Amino acid sequence: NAIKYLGQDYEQLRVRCLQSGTLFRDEAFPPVPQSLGYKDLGPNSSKTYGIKWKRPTELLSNPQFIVDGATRTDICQGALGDCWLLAAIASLTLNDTLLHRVVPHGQSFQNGYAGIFHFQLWQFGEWVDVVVDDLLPIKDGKLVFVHSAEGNEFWSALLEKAYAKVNGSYEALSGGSTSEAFEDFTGGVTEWYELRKAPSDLYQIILKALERGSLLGCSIDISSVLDMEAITFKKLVKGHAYSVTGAKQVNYRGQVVSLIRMRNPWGEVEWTGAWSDSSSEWNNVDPYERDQLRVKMEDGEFWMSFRDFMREFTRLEICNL
């Protein structure tokens, strides 16, 4: 069982509020400017213009914690540089057991709701249970930071808030290592690969890791300094954390091709090359595999041949449990 972060007891607080007919207000991470940031998101920064704090129950009639499952498409980056964290959460959703530990399912905005939620995070050698009240940064009636493709789903926004909490603020989440989040969601350890000097069996390593439920991420190195999140001509993003969400060898024109699937945590802007959603490669793949693997949707997720992946990406991270 997880340790209580800052001694905060989710069940107790929830019961206490539920009994007092009140909603939880987190003293350890209040809906104040400091919780948003200190510099670019500081009290006197224009980026915080119009940002207010509101509970989902104050925005919609029936907000939901989880809708159609807690999946990777529920992770769509907002106005914050926490791609590393979001790619980790999206990868986390693929390991059903760990996902259910980090994200306690069964939390709802209906039965037993008292404006409080909790999440488990592995922090400095131990699993800790972190609580947050459900006040979230909103602007123009929309979540400012992470949001699900589904506007009425809030589990991911709440998880990001809990992660911001352990970091002192949302701004503190700007800039980071996907490896760190992978480990904080698993208690596992990340091994990194320099794709230009990778094992001949790297694809097999990726296959086995995905099957085991390890978390995988990848990125393109940025040596141009300020080309951070620069979109390439083929619509890959540099200095940006991607979730490696799949890998399968497919029967193509009667042959076998090694593909890798990844997801841009933005939830949009996808590779336009071979194997992308509407690419012609799919016309010559087995009708069943095409149906199982290819989804024509601007959801940030797409396939690439392993060769193109090795040619376009510079690093791969595998966090094994």
Smallest distance from Ca ion to CB 29, Å: 24
Instruction: Yes or no: say if 303 and 259 are a contact pair by the CB < 8 Å rule.
Output: yes
Catalytic residue among 76, 118, 218, 264: 264
After which residues is the chain discontinuous, taking C to N > 2.5 Å? none
Catalytic residue among 17, 95, 218, 240: 240
Tell whether residue 291 is among the known ligand binding residues: yes
108 vs 204, beta carbon nearer Ca ion: 108
Identify the H or E element spanning 191.
strand 189-194
Please tell me whether residue 191 binds Ca ion under the rule CB under 5 A.
no
Tell whether residue 284 is among the known ligand binding residues: yes
160 vs 301, beta carbon nearer Ca ion: 301
Instruction: Yes or no: say if 149 and 76 are a contact pair by the CB < 8 Å rule.
Output: yes
109 vs 302, beta carbon nearer Ca ion: 302
**Which residue bears the tokens 């399912």?**
105
Instruction: Yes or no: say if 118 and 106 are a contact pair by the CB < 8 Å rule.
Output: no
Give the tokens for residue 104.
């306690």
Give the tokens for residue 4.
């209580």
Q: Which of 26, 82, 184, 301 binds Ca ion (CB under 5 A)?
A: 301
Please tell me whether residue 268 binds Ca ion under the rule CB under 5 A.
no
* Selected range binding Ca ion among 2-10, 233-241, 270-278, 307-315, rule: CB under 5 A: 270-278
Task: Catalogue the E-assigned strands of 94-178.
Answer: 116-123, 126-133, 136-139, 142-143
Q: What residues contact residue 76 under an 8 Å CB cut-off, 6+ apart?
A: 146, 147, 148, 149, 265, 266, 267, 268, 300
17 vs 86, beta carbon nearer Ca ion: 86
Number of H helices, E strands in the chain: 10, 12
Catalytic residue among 76, 83, 218, 319: 83
Q: Which of 277, 279, 307, 320 binds Ca ion (CB under 5 A)?
A: 277
Smallest distance from Ca ion to CB 242, Å: 12
Tell me the Cα Rg of the chain: 20
183 vs 301, beta carbon nearer Ca ion: 301
Name residues contacting Ca ion, limited to 141-160 (CB under 5 A).
153
240 flagged as catalytic? yes
Task: Summarize as ranges the residues that interact with Ca ion (CB under 5 A).
Answer: 67-68, 74, 153, 277, 297, 299, 301-302
Catalytic residue list: 83, 240, 264
Give the residue ranges of the annotated binding site for Ca(2+).
77, 82, 284, 286, 291
